[PDB]
RNA sequence: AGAGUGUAGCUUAAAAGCACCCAACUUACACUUAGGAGAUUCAAUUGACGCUCUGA
């Protein structure tokens, strides 16, 4: 059934008149631009560290599965066989208190 | 007098021109030249270019257009080349570093508009 | 990495203000939700 | 009648049977970019072009 | 050649608890929360404090504070969970929850006669079974344990080739879902590591390379 | 010209796709299409799982359907958004799931069901 | 211990060009705009500091 809940609700339109003041000083987005740039550079080093790890599984799984092929003709045909039990697979996210 | 090649209709750019201006804007360098019809390129302005770099902070940002637009002004009335045709993509035009250069072609004395050929 | 997709936004401009209630479901696991009349503190019965 | 042409063809070695595995084009730009590269580029055929036609000082700009 | 067959687990432990933000994130999930207080639409709890005010001070002339306070009160009832579980045991590695943020790694001293070595969980296998069911038989066996886990794929992670009669070793990669680890001072020499003090217990070639596909994070 | 040796200099539509079971023969095992159920209480934070998650199957060259959502649910409002996503190896599929495992922010549970 | 060696991720580039990231429009992706970080491993073609492979 082609019904989503991107509608807007109807309240957001009349008493828009809370805030009208945004308002800064010269300081304030000299550090939000400095944090800006900063936050690019953090965030092009965190994903760099997740390629280079990622290379670096798939190049050690890529020698696995080879060394695994010229060491045992019989078990690389089963090595990429993939699982049925991946179907209802389930994990949820991380919390902050233990039970 | 001369003749411009007044073709080119269906393709983008058109060559209808005596002299051309082409903006590349790189991941770190913005160039902009001034060529003429044949290919070959008359004025160049590069921010690979010791004396314009060593004054930048960076060498792609409003700024650097707005001094590069100063420097090819300034190149092009020692150079002689006075008028110009030129021919931004849409999206391209809106944008402000380059509608800041078209500010520092008029502000220099280099008319975007080149006059008609007389037949 | 668990705080590359919690350091987030609202990508819309028709919204309302938004605050960090901790909840609680029924496991004492106190999670920051953006939410509306902003309590502390939750527990489902 | 099919004759066999001159020199290489261009848009061949990129002919694959799987295209969705290679990179493309997203943009505007890149594609005019790359067009004027080979447009620079002399051809077999018949084109408009045929009718028409030291560390010392690294180290201080870096310190600059 | 006489090829002697050991395959292996590199068993992981999914974080519970999520890791704890630099400063510099707070500074700017601070300002995060100031440019979402700035472009928010007039909410209704707002008017139920502002406009509620000057109303009652206009009758006044001619509650959202005891809520906010009962709030804050129910907030200092109920402790939160301390997420160090961690400092202040600081020896107990025989124990699944020594700690939260990062994950674990199973690994067990082992007796050889020609060595004594501290090696990821192995066992001996015959070409009759399925490697997946080698590292099952090596979770249901090697730990006498009641732990529910859960593989991604039979595709090995990391494999290491070391002789004296030839040896291989593969290394699989497990993810613990549940566990019920009954009688947690066993007498065997199970550590969990997150990823440092396997530098400090994996010496040679074959087993200081552990962590380039053990996920670091 | 179809006689000159430059014949077909311009064609196009060989290089234009002018237009599920897996696909498991004997060699290539290939997934076919999935359904990733990011639910969570917040839009925010969906939203963002969601956008970085189709950043990875974009720049790890993934094929990706759709990105719709289905309608919340009144209970605290439930949200969440569907990735469809096909093309692994399945070195890549445990690279791929373990990557998406680990990069969890809070609380948000995760799913691989197929298609219907 | 020996061999292959060596420009940011890639270059039969000579300090570049494509890559990459954040901010804005997009449910989302993508485009575009605004910004950002980048390197010729150290000494006089040669030797030695870093990586890979082959040995014990």
Not at chain 1, 45 to 50: A, G, H, S
Not at chain 2, 100 to 109: I, K, N, P
Request: proline share 5%; with cysteine; aromatic share 8%.
């Amino acid at each position: 059934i082609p019904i989503e809940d991107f509608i807007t609700p109807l309240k957001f339109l009349d008493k828009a008149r809370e805030r009208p003041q945004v308002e800064l000083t010269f300081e304030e987005t000299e550090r939000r631009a400095l944090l800006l740039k900063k936050w690019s550079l953090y965030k092009q080093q965190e994903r760099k560290m997740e390629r280079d790890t990622i290379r670096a599984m798939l190049e050690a799984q890529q020698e696995a599965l080879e060394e695994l092929q010229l060491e045992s003709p019989k078990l690389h045909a089963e090595a990429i066989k993939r699982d049925p039990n991946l179907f209802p697979f389930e994990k949820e996210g991380p919390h902050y208190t233990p039970p | 007098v001369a003749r411009k090649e007044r073709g080119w209709r269906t393709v983008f750019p058109s060559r209808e021109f005596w002299h051309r201006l082409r903006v590349i804007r790189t991941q770190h360098h913005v160039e902009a030249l001034v060529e003429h019809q044949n290919g070959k390129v008359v004025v160049s302005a590069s921010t690979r270019e010791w004396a314009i770099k060593k004054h930048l902070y960076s060498t792609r940002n409003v700024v650097a257009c707005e001094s590069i637009g100063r420097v090819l002004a300034q190149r092009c009335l020692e150079a002689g080349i006075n008028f110009m045709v030129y021919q931004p993509t849409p999206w391209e035009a809106a944008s402000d570093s380059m509608k800041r250069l078209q500010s520092a072609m008029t502000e220099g004395g280099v008319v975007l508009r080149e006059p008609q050929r007389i037949y | 990495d668990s705080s590359r997709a919690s350091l987030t936004r609202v990508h819309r401009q028709a919204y309302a203000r938004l605050y960090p209630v901790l909840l609680v479901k029924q496991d004492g696991s106190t999670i920051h939700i953006r939410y509306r009349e902003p309590r502390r503190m939750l527990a489902m019965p | 009648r099919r004759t066999p042409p001159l020199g290489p063809m261009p848009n061949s070695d990129i002919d694959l049977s799987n295209l969705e595995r290679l990179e493309k084009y997203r943009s505007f730009d890149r594609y005019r970019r790359r067009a004027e590269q080979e447009a620079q580029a002399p051809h077999w055929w018949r084109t408009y072009r045929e009718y028409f036609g030291r560390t010392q000082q690294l180290l201080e700009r870096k310190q600059a | 050649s006489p090829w002697r067959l050991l395959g292996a687990l590199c068993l992981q432990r999914p974080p519970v608890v999520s890791k704890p933000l630099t400063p510099l994130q707070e500074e700017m999930a601070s300002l995060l929360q100031q440019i979402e207080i700035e472009r928010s639409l007039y909410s209704d709890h707002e008017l139920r404090a502002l406009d509620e005010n000057q109303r009652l001070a206009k009758k006044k002339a001619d509650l959202a504070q005891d809520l906010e306070d009962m709030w804050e009160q129910k907030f200092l009832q109920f402790k939160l969970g301390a997420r160090i579980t961690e400092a202040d045991e600081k020896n107990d590695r025989t124990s699944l929850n020594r700690k939260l943020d990062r994950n674990l790694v199973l690994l067990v001293r082992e007796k050889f006669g020609d060595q004594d070595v501290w090696i990821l969980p192995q066992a001996e296998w015959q070409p009759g079974e399925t490697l997946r069911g080698t590292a099952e038989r090596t979770l249901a066996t090697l730990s006498e344990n009641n732990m529910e886990a859960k593989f991604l794929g039979n595709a090995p992670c990391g494999h290491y080739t070391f002789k004296f009669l030839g040896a291989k070793v593969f290394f699989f990669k497990a993810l613990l879902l549940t566990g019920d680890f009954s009688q947690a001072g066993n007498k065997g020499h199970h550590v969990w590591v997150t990823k440092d003090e396997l530098g400090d217990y994996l010496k040679p070639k074959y087993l200081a390379q552990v962590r380039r596909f053990v996920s670091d994070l | 010209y179809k006689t000159k040796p430059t014949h077909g200099i311009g064609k196009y539509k060989h290089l234009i796709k002018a237009e599920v079971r897996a696909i498991n023969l004997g060699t290539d095992y290939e997934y076919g299409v999935l359904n990733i159920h990011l639910t969570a209480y917040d839009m925010t934070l969906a939203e963002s799982y969601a956008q970085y998650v189709h950043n990875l199957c974009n720049s790890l060259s993934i094929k990706v359907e759709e990105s719709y959502a289905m309608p919340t649910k009144t209970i605290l409002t439930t949200h969440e958004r569907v990735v469809q996503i096909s093309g692994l190896s399945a070195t890549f599929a445990e690279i791929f799931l373990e990557i998406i495992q680990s990069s969890l922010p809070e609380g948000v549970r995760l799913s691989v069901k197929e298609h219907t």
